[PDB]
């Protein structure tokens, strides 16, 4: 009678940025997905490959809950086959993505009258991220061939840009909390089962 710690990912008081997204693994527990319905309110709920209505009658070997904060304009980028800065330099989902992406407006929690600048996103990178790859380097992006010796300027740009969430911002620029569930049934025996 061990319940999977899905709650500690959703109702958590603190969420991380998108360039430094958080991930919690799930294993050896009963995954009851009733909280995905009739609980609070979700602005976005896009499942790929799996039907959540049947998630209660399945068992998986690997389950991962990723969590971060973006803005509305970017919640569409959290999907397989998406482009842009978020899908290239921050958080990318593979083409054969088999999970779900949930997102809810958190303008009442992640917005201050003076502007919340604790949520950053990566702006420059040498190459695109591979599926489920996290980069937290603060090195000045050497845009050219001249070495940026810790000083910004021409062809020397800081890689992280602040969101600046404000309460008077439009819904497209308001903070949305995003949780991505990823299910994998590999050669190992499945342990993350649902009530069956």
């Amino acid at each position, epitope marked *: 009678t061990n319940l999977c710690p899905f709650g500690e990912v959703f109702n958590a008081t603190r969420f991380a940025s998108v360039y430094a997204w958080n991930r919690k693994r799930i294993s050896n527990c009963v995954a009851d997905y009733s909280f995905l319905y009739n609980s609070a309110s979700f602005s976005t709920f896009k499942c790929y490959g799996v039907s959540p209505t049947k998630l209660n009658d399945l068992c998986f070997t690997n389950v991962y809950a990723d969590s971060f904060v973006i803005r509305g304009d970017e919640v569409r980028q959290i999907a397989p086959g998406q482009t842009g800065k978020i899908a290239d330099y921050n958080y990318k989902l593979p083409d054969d993505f088999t999970g779900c992406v949930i997102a809810w407006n958190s303008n009442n929690l992640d917005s201050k009258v003076g502007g919340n600048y604790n949520y950053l996103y990566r702006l420059f990178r040498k190459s695109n991220l591979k599926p489920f790859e996290r980069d937290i380097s603060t090195e000045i992006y050497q845009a*050219g061939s*001249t070495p940026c010796n810790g000083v910004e300027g021409f*062809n020397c740009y*800081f890689p992280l840009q602040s969101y600046g969430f404000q309460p008077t911002n439009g819904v497209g620029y308001q903070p949305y909390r995003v949780v991505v569930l990823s299910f994998e049934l590999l050669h190992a025996p499945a342990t993350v089962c649902g009530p069956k």
Partner: antibody
Amino acid sequence: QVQLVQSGPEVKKPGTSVKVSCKASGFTFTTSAVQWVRQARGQRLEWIGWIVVGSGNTNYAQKFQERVTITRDMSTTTAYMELSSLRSEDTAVYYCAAPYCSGGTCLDGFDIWGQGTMVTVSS
Amino acid sequence: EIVLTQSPGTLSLSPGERATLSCRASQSVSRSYLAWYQQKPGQAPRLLIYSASSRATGIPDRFSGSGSGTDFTLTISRLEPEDFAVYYCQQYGSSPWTFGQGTKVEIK
């Protein structure tokens, strides 16, 4: 073609505002930068300012910091320079310049130059 | 700001004479950020030398910059009518980027 097309010349009465456009083509514009500099006919080059495309961070000159504004749009890869309160001395040609970026790297200088937008202020 | 003063003011030479310019600064400027541009009457400035002593793509091998600190020079070996223009030095390492006053080269 890898060029930088500016906007056509406009004639503006004193005290109004002009917005010179600047669209890049042929190279990766996401990590490049755009600098704006004006030049009168037969006179020196007066640097106005510069902007980073990826971030939008701007740096202006000491004399234009109160009257110029440099912005960019990455969806169309177009830079804009808006100058307000046009006095008589603003009558010059305004060039935007950007380095060349074919991959992840860029050039350490501004090789690409626009054709120039001559702004004339008279009555 | 970093003031860039160019010497001499004007020049007049003939095909075959090595023309040398100079553009000094009030403070030490990094070599990697002082470009030399060419501007012929009618066209936009044409980048000759970027960083310092590094020729752009397409520039003939006659143009060569060289210098350090508060002293930089530009030299041309073969004087053809293509080299008749004004030449400017621009530093882009300080907070406000400064140009030179121009060195008109009236080649005869």
